[PDB]
Design a binder for this molecule. Structure first.
Ligand SMILES: [K+]
Ligand SMILES: [K+]
Ligand SMILES: [K+]
Ligand SMILES: [Mn+2]
Ligand SMILES: [Mn+2]
Ligand SMILES: [Mn+2]
Ligand SMILES: [Mn+2]
Ligand SMILES: [Mn+2]
Length: 136
RNA sequence: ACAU
DNA sequence: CGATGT
């Protein structure tokens, strides 16, 4: 309904899907970039969206912030809720890095707690999420 | 269909 | 146009 401006917004960016994956988190209110992940040579949009949320959870917990996280990815929000990233990406030598990061993110979710609300950014009403890469 |  | 997902 109304945007919660006191929040963290996260998003993936990619070159190809599967392709080079990165992500970032921004202050929804100002657009200040708060974190950015070094590009990963092969991954999927959804793996990156998932990593971005989990990193946001870890970022906010470390700073004792109760702000919610916005994501535009229905898939990744569900994967975080389930603590399980149900990616179809083949596990092979060239996808090993992204899969290691995904497996490590799931592992962190399974050994830590948080109350952070993870909210759907309503692109149809509000435009692109503030962490978007501007590539579409 | 919806979400990327 | 095509790929990732529920
Ligand atoms: K979008
Ligand atoms: K984009
Ligand atoms: K589809
Ligand atoms: Mn997105
Ligand atoms: Mn796993
Ligand atoms: Mn985007
Ligand atoms: Mn376009
Ligand atoms: Mn397009």
């Amino acid at each position: 309904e109304e945007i919660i401006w006191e929040s963290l917004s996260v998003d993936v960016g990619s070159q190809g899907n599967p392709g080079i994956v990165e992500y970032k988190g921004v202050d929804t209110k100002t657009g200040e970039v708060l974190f950015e992940r070094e590009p990963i040579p092969i991954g999927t949009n959804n793996m990156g969206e998932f990593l971005a949320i989990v990193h946001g959870l870890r970022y906010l917990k470390e700073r004792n912030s109760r702000k919610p996280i916005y994501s535009d990815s229905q898939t990744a929000i569900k994967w975080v809720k389930d603590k399980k990233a149900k990616s179809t990406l083949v596990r092979n030598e060239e996808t090993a890095l992204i899969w290691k990061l995904v497996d490590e993110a799931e592992e962190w979710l399974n050994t830590h707690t948080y109350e952070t609300p993870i909210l759907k950014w309503q692109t149809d009403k509000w435009g692109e999420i503030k962490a978007d890469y501007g590539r579409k």
